[PDB]
Amino acid sequence: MYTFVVRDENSSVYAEVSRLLLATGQWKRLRKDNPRFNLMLGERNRLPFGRLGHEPGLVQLVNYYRGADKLCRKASLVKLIKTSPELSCTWFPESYIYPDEREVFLAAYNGNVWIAKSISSEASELLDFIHVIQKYLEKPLLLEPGHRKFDIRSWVLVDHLYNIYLYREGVLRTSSEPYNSAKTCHLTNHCIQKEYYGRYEEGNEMFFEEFNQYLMDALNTTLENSILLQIKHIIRSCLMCIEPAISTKHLHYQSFQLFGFDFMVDEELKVWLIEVNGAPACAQKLYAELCQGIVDVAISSVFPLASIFIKL
Amino acid sequence: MRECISIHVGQAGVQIGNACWELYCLEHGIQPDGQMPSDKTIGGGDDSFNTFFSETGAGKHVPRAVFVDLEPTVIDEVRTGTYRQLFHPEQLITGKEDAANNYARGHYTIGKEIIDLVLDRIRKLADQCTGLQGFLVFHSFGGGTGSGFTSLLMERLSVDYGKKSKLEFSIYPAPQVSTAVVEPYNSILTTHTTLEHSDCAFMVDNEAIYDICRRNLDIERPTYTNLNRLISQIVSSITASLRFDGALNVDLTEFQTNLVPYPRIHFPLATYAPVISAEKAYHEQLSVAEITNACFEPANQMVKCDPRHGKYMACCLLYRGDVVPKDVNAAIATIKTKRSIQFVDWCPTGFKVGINYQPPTVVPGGDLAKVQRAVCMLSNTTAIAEAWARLDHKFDLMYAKRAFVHWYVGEGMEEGEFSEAREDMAALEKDYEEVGVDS
Amino acid sequence: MEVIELNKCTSGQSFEVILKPPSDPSLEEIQKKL
Amino acid sequence: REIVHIQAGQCGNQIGAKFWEVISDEHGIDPTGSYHGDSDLQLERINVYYNEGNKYVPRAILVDLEPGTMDSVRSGPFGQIFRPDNFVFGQSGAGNNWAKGHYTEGAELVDSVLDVVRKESESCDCLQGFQLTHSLGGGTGSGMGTLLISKIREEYPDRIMNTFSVMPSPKVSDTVVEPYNATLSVHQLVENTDETYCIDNEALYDICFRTLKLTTPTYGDLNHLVSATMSGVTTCLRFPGQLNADLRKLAVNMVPFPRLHFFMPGFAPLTSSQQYRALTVPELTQQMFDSKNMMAACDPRHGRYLTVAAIFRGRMSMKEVDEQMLNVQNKNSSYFVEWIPNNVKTAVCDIPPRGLKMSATFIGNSTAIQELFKRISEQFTAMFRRKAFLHWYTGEGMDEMEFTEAESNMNDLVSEYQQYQDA
Ligand SMILES: COc1cc([C@@H]2c3cc4c(cc3[C@H](Sc3nnc[nH]3)[C@@H]3COC(=O)[C@H]23)OCO4)cc(OC)c1OC
Ligand SMILES: Nc1nc2c(ncn2[C@@H]2O[C@H](COP(=O)(O)OP(=O)(O)OP(=O)(O)O)[C@@H](O)[C@H]2O)c(=O)[nH]1
Ligand SMILES: Nc1ncnc2c1ncn2[C@@H]1O[C@H](COP(=O)(O)OP(=O)(O)CP(=O)(O)O)[C@@H](O)[C@H]1O
Ligand SMILES: Nc1nc2c(ncn2[C@@H]2O[C@H](COP(=O)(O)OP(=O)(O)O)[C@@H](O)[C@H]2O)c(=O)[nH]1
Ligand SMILES: [Ca+2]
Ligand SMILES: [Mg+2]
Ligand SMILES: [Mg+2]
Ligand SMILES: [Mg+2]
Ligand SMILES: [Mg+2]
Ligand code: NA
């Protein structure tokens, strides 16, 4: 009989994961602050990693990698991609500061559109709205009919052995507004699309089977060849780069973590990393399958009872 | 030559002190009757080993050591042990009834009664010293004596020996090795009271020693003897530079100079390798690169924590055995490109290295096998603050309900001293965060 | 990677290796508390 | 660190004499006081309970207000072993009346007892404190015993007071006034003891009838359980090892708040012996923590464990003990409080009791003990609301006010235990 605790009630994904653990009769949920647990579904911020792995007779596992934030916040990721000998690249947009690299940003500024986050053609306009300034991809790949923009979300699971698992099912989050290069047909955020949709696909969400068919009909190529090879390359580059820093291989406690990678695709079918998310949600259609895969490969591998993933 | 006086307080300090002096005698070829055939200056000398041993006209080498416990049963196993002849009665000090796992009883109630005696017996050792450097103090964080009396003694040592250095070897509590339920209280109380009187403190977490004993010696349920013989190996690695010829950490002041830039952040992490079972017939001898690499494995540390998620202020590598500088620098260069090793920005990224060619001594019949080389790394990393955060958290849980507090107030301690102590530890935790993390 | 302050004796040696440079209560007050 | 043992009244001297028979055997002391054992753990801490022609004498004082039961001890198997001057008795008896034990009959005899206590305490190199055996339902153990405890505290205020207190039950009752005597006594214990083992005659009867399938349990059967418990619960005080416990460390570690010092013991295997199949360590741990094995009729699942100390005796896997002990907490974490970390501790002793190759004993400070004080409070109140049987007590000088205050203090105690069951 294994025990676990739940310290993130706002977690869509691990709400489903715990309900599956219970429904096996071999997992018991304790109260949040009970230390005598096997499994912690931790909080998003200030999770107390220093108290893990000190309970006698308990193998302890947590669903976050301490140190993963360096991939998963946009300033850290630009720094990481810029100072790591193993990436610092080609698939990451030229990115650049606090309200440093201000002299250097203006030096390349000498298509000249950029975006700030943490969109303009004039540097002066945004430096005083201020954070990272990232080269805006002026020539995206546009879905038709619709002349529309999109981003690809990939779910990636890293288990306690630091095996990297790419979920078979991605999702394209699409703009329902034709793309005008002269801020809604520019932001594919789903909450921004269903507030400012449902036109062509249910939920501005196109899944891989349809998107592959689209590439076969429209471009005479496949999702695997034209895009996923680059996706798998990028996922490996980022996670293998940070591996010595965050691996729990010889640690007194064990980590796994689910990541959401966000990619852009341009006109020449080149894939670009936009960002990495450390606490991703899922597509409703996919919750059941992915949360079951999390239990199978991340949790029961450590705590056995009585493939939907590509192995990267 | 400048002398060092060792002081062992409470059960853990005494029983560990027993193991160390046993080891020191083996390392220096001193027989249990105190005779030392290697020493050709009878009844005197100022060799390096005289820092820890004085000499009688009869040729006996006597530890500059005092053993103190508020109960007689542990020290009585020194009186009647294998080295009875080594110590003389004045150095073994026992009271009548112990501190009952209670810092306040060890510090206020019984400590008052016995401090002047202990200080008098230490004075008899200091008077034999031509140039006393200071003290090495062995004690538990958790015991009533080890916590309560040690802190009173350290305060009085700063009074009576103001210019002298004081080093600690502190046993940090772990439920795997029988602990009182109030050990968090005792630990915080004594750290607060001792913080400004100690120049450098080596914490040893019983959880770490216990696990090394299970994993590397494959002892299923290690005894105090198993634990203490491993601890003594690490202690001996740390104090070798005081007792042998060399140029690194040759007096107590250098420990502070080399390991402690900031006086409050004075708890270096010790990491030791290799630890090899003696019933393991044929084992490959680990290389300089391997044992040095093992110094960055949390499984070999004296306190479990993650140095990758902290910053280094200072790092010393102490090798024993067949080791030359060439191999050290090769191993370091390799390790710098694979490990995550961040120093604070105001400190040089580097290593002070000391090598003693004599390989470690082990106790005949013990569970540790002889090795041809070993290393102890001493690093001041902010990651050790995880140990404080853990302890501080347990203290909070109990104190929020004032559980057990009445035992402490009943001995004359004011409840306010809990809050005083805990607030000091809160500052301590934030000092570490300032030094080693960025927002 | 610089090696400085190398000292040798018959018992061993010591040195420093640099990889990168950088960017009290009284007796009476005690007696009162007791 | 010597313990002075006092046994008072009929129950006190009966379970007292059994305790000395049992541990005398365990330490290899024969009825004539000469040591004829085969191991040296036996003698290493023998002086905790025995004084020393190389004969050993229990540091035991035998007290009663009538000479009957102590004539029975002097004729019993080990009767020769007690120091004859340590028998202190009167002729009148206490009539199952707390007031007589505490205020009239007992007051006459208590100074004689303290002279014997004082003499034993003087021959002590370092006195740990006192251990008293008694019931709360009678007159001498209950009334005079708590009077002794008060007089002892006043003369030795810095020593520990420990009691084994037998709580009355209607299932094993001598008189209807037992709830009155027990309620008056609990009040004394809340104030003047540091540790009280609650030995509940209801739990002992249930265990004899259900588990041991003895359909007509005698006091002899009940006392077999109490004897086994007293031995196990004192093991770490009498034997050397890893952890050498004493009365003060017991109290510091088990009592988080001064009034909550009433412990539920538990024992395994429960026996009436007759069986040779030794138990596996898993089974010891399972039974010991089962309600059907605890000597106080309280459901631990109705409350929470504040602190627990367990001792395993015999030869067995230290590694398996730790595994099973850690298993029980990690499987029922709900019944241990969050705000006392690591509140379950385990010891081992190689020397098993008699007739058992391995055993386990459990000391628990559980909030479920409030059920025992509620039960007594209810029985007390049923009579006291009609002032029934009170003339037995007012005839000795007592006023009703004293009963009201005792009722109030015991209900407070129940409340305090409930306060921490909801913390
Ligand atoms: C009277 O017998 C026992 C007492 C204790 C008891 C005792 C009782 C406890 C407790 C702790 C502790 C501590 S344990 C310790 N080990 N090193 C320092 N302190 C201490 C030690 O001496 C003690 O007397 C304390 O937590 C909850 O209940 C424990 C026992 O077994 C675990 C014994 O048998 C059950
Ligand atoms: N490593 C090691 N730890 C010990 C040893 N003895 C006790 N401990 C640990 O020390 C702490 C208990 O304090 P002790 O030193 O035994 O107690 P004490 O200082 O004698 O104080 P009192 O007995 O309360 O007067 C616990 O955390 C034990 O686990 C030992 O020989 N070796
Ligand atoms: N260089 C860039 N070029 C083109 N489009 C970009 C872009 N950067 C961001 N976008 C668009 O913005 C949308 C979301 O932006 P971004 O991923 O940077 O913030 P976010 O809302 O996703 C924070 P998080 O998801 O981590 O909580 C993307 O879907 C994309 O359409
Ligand atoms: N367990 C046990 N209980 C007893 C024994 N003798 C009496 N009792 C109980 O003790 C209470 C009566 O007290 P008793 O000791 O006989 O009176 P006293 O002599 O005045 O102290 C009742 O609750 C009885 O059930 C005994 O030998 N064993
Ligand atoms: Ca000499
Ligand atoms: Mg996003
Ligand atoms: Mg002690
Ligand atoms: Mg000198
Ligand atoms: Mg009777
Ligand atoms: Na009379």
Task: Give the residue extent of every domain in chain B.
Answer: 1-268, 269-383, 384-439
Resolution in Å, one decimal place: 2.3
Q: Is D354 in the same domain as D392?
A: no
User: Of D410, D419, D225, D408, nearest to D306 (Cα)?
Assistant: D419
Same topology, domains B1-268 and B384-439? Answer is no
Q: How many residues in total does chain A contain?
A: 312
Q: Please check whether residues D204 and D217 belong to one and the same domain.
A: yes
CB D64 within 8 A of CB D10: yes
Ligand 2 geometric centre to CA of B18 (Å): 14
Residues A158 and A240 grouped into a single domain: yes
- The CATH number given to whatever domain includes residue D338 is 3.30.1330.20
Q: Which domain holds residue D332?
A: 257-368
Tell me whether strands D358-366 and D305-314 are parallel, antiparallel or unpaired. Answer: antiparallel
A3 and D333: CB-CB below 8 Å?
Answer: yes
CA atoms of B254 and D271, how far apart (whole Å) = 65
Q: Does B343 touch chain D (CB under 8 A)?
A: no
Contacts of D44 (CB under 8 A, 6+ apart): D239, D240
Residue D181 and residue D57 share a domain: yes
Residues D343 and D401 in one domain: no
Q: Which residues pair with B9 in a beta bridge?
A: B68
Question: Which residue is listed with tokens 């104090």?
Answer: B239
3-class DSSP state of A6: strand
D359 and D303, same structural domain? Answer: yes
Q: Please identify, among D218, D239, D256, the residue that sits at the C-terminal boundary of a domain.
A: D256
Amino acid present at B292: T
| Two structure tokens written together for D332 | 């029922």
Name every residue whose Cβ is closer than 8 Å to that of residue B30 and which is 6 or more positions away in sequence: B24, B36, B53, B61
| d(C-alpha D133, C-alpha D130), whole Å | 10
* 3-class DSSP assignment, residue C10: coil
Dist CA C12 CA B320 (whole Å) = 9
- D153 and D217 inside one domain: yes
End-of-domain residue from the set D229, D256, D283: D256
Q: Cis peptide leading into C21, omega within 30 of 0?
A: no
Q: Half-sphere exposure of residue B64, counting CA atoms within 13 Å on the CB side?
A: 27
Q: Is D281 helix (H, G, I), strand (E, B) or coil?
A: helix
**Is residue B436 part of an annotated ligand binding site?**
no
B330 burial level (CB within 10 Å; 0-12, 13-18, 19+):
middle
d(C-alpha B215, C-alpha B196), whole Å: 37
Q: Which 3-state string (H, E, C) describes B100-149?
A: CCCHHHHHHHHHHHHHHHHHHHHHHHHCCCCCCCEEEEEEECCCHHHHHH
Cα D238 → chain centroid: 16
Pick from B93, B119, B134: nearest CA to B9: B93
- The answer to whether the CB of D198 falls within 8 A of the CB of D296 is yes
- Cα–Cα distance for residue pair B2/B307, rounded to 1 Å: 35
- Contact across the interface for A57 and D330, Cβ inside 8 Å: yes
Based on the fold, state whether residues D374 and D364 are members of the same structural domain: no
Alpha helices in D193-334 (DSSP H): 201-206, 219-238, 247-254, 281-289, 318-331
Tell me: do A56 and A76 sit in the same domain: no
Reduced to 3 states (helix: H, G, I; strand: E, B; else coil), residue C28 is: helix
Q: Is the peptide bond before D269 cis (omega within 30 degrees of 0)?
A: yes
Hey, what amino acid is at D383?
M
3-class DSSP state of A46: coil
The backbone torsions φ and ψ at residue D287, rounded to the nearest 5 degrees and listed phi first, read -70, -55
Tell whether A195 and A77 lie within a shared domain: yes
Q: Ligand 3 pocket, A151 CB below 6 A?
A: yes
Ligand 3 centroid – CA A96 distance (Å): 15
Nearest in space to B206 (alpha carbons), one of B144, B154, B143: B143
Q: Are B30 and B5 in contact (CB under 8 A)?
A: no
**CATH number, position A3:** 3.40.50.11480
Residue among B385, B322, B377, B383 nearest B351 (CA)? B377
For D175-213, letters b (16+ CB in 10 Å) and e give bebbbbbbbbbbbbbbebbbbbbbbbbbbbbbbbeebbe
For residue D352, count other CB atoms closer than 10 A to its CB: 17
| Same domain (yes/no): D53, D160 | yes
Q: How far is B356 from chain A (nearest CA, A)?
A: 30
Whether residues D357 and D376 fall in one domain: no
Q: Please tell us whether the domain made up of B1-268 is placed in CATH 3.40.50.1440.
A: yes
Q: Is B43 annotated as a binding residue?
A: no
Provide the H-helix boundaries in A139-282. 190-193, 208-219, 223, 229-246
CA distance D3 to B225: 30
Q: Is the CB of A134 under 6 A from ligand 3?
A: yes
> Residue B428's Cα: distance from chain center in Å?
20
Short-list A235, A206, A236, CA closest to A223? A206
Nearest-CA neighbor of D24 among D81, D90, D63, D96?
D81
Please return the burial class of B285, using the count of CB atoms within 10 Å of its CB with bins 0-12, 13-18 and 19+: middle
CATH number, domain with residue A147: 3.30.470.20
**Other beta carbons within 10 Å of D51:** 16
Q: Do D329 and A36 touch (CB under 8 A)?
A: yes
Query: CA-CA distance, D414 to D374, in Å (whole number)?
Result: 7
- Decide: A134 and A121 in contact? Cβ < 8 Å: no
Test the A interface: residue of D321, D329, D333 with most A CBs within 10 Å: D333
Rounded CA separation D360/A227 (Å): 66
The Cβ of residue D117 has, within 10 Å, a number of other Cβ atoms equal to 23
Q: Does A69 lie in the same domain as A59?
A: no
State how far the Cα of C24 lies from the Cα of D116, in Å rounded to an integer.
Answer: 51
CA–CA gap between residue B118 and residue B120 (Å, rounded): 5
Q: CB-based burial of residue D10 (10 Å sphere; 0-12 exposed, 13-18 middle, 19+ buried)?
A: buried
Number of other CB atoms surrounding residue D388 within 10 Å: 12
Q: In what order do the strands lie in the sheet with A254-255?
A: A27-29, A2-6, A39-41, A61-62, A254-255
Q: Look-up: residue for tokens 């007292």? A: D16
- Whether residues A144 and A59 fall in one domain: no
Domain boundaries, position A301: 64-93+139-312
Cα A76 to ligand 9 centre (Å)? 80
Phi, psi torsion values for B352, nearest 5 degrees: -85, 130
Find the radius of gyration of the CA atoms of chain A: 21
Q: Which residues of B are catalytic?
A: 254
DSSP track, D105-152: HHHHHHHHHHHHHHHHHHT-SSEEEEEEEEESSSSIIIIIHHHHHHHH
Residues D5 and D136 in one domain: yes
Same domain, yes or no, for D183 and D34?
A: yes
The pair phi, psi for residue B204, each rounded to 5°, is -120, 120
State whether A165 and A30 are in the same domain: no
Contact present, B and C (at least 3 Cβ pairs less than 8 Å): yes
* Sequence-ordered strand ranges (E) for chain A: 2-6, 27-29, 39-41, 61-62, 114-117, 132-135, 150-158, 164-167, 171-174, 205-207, 254-255, 257-265, 271-277, 309-311
D5 three-class SS: strand
DSSP summary character for residue A278: S
Give the fold, CATH level 3, of B269-383: 60s Ribosomal Protein L30; Chain: A; (3.30.1330)
A7 Cβ contact partners less than 8 Å away, ≥ 6 residues apart: A32, A40, A41, A42, A43, A47
B384-439 is a CATH 1.10.287.600 domain: yes
SS3 D369: helix
**Exposed, middle or buried by CB within 10 Å (0-12, 13-18, 19+), for B11?**
buried
CA A93 – CA A183 distance, rounded (Å)? 20
Is the CB of A250 less than 8 angstroms away from the CB of B298? yes
Kind plus residue range of the DSSP H or E element containing D51: strand D50-51
Q: How was this structure determined?
A: X-ray
CB D133 within 8 Å of CB D15: yes
> Are A17 and A86 members of one domain?
no
Cα gap D42→D1, rounded to integer Å:
16
Residue showing tokens 């214990």: D189
Q: What is the DSSP letter of A260?
A: E
Same domain flag for A34 and A76: no
SS3 label, residue A36: coil
D44 and D119 together in one domain: yes
Question: Domain total for chain D?
Answer: 3
User: What φ, ψ does residue D115 adopt, rounded to 5°?
Assistant: -65, -40
The CATH number assigned to the domain holding D394 equals 1.10.287.600
- Whether residue A28 is found in the same domain as residue A157: no
Query: Which residue from A14, A23, A24 is spatially nearest to A61, judged by alpha carbons?
Result: A14
CA separation for the pair D70, D91 (Å, rounded): 11
Question: Three-class SS string for chain B?
Answer: CCCEEEEEEHHHHHHHHHHHHHHHHHHCCCCCCCECCCCCCCCCCCCHHHHCEEECCCCEEEECEEEEECCCCCCHHHHCCCCHHHCCHHHEEECCCCCCCCHHHHHHHHHHHHHHHHHHHHHHHHCCCCCCCEEEEEEECCCHHHHHHHHHHHHHHHHHCCCCEEEEEEEECECCECCCCCHHHHHHHHHHHHHHHCCEEEEEEHHHHHHHHHHCCCCCCCCHHHHHHHHHHHHHHHHHHHHCCCCCCCCHHHHHHHHCCCCCCCCCEEEEECCCECCCCCCCCCCHHHHHHHHHCHHHECCCCCHHHCCEEEEEEEEEECCCHHHHHHHHHHHHHHCCCCECCCCCEEEEEEEECCCCCCCCCCCECCCCEEEEEEEEEHHHHHHHHHHHHHHHHHHCCCCCHHHHHCCCCCCHHHHHHHHHHHHHHHHHHHHHCCC
Nearest-CA neighbor of B197 among B247, B150, B239? B150
CA-CA distance, B417 to B409, in Å (whole number)? Answer: 10
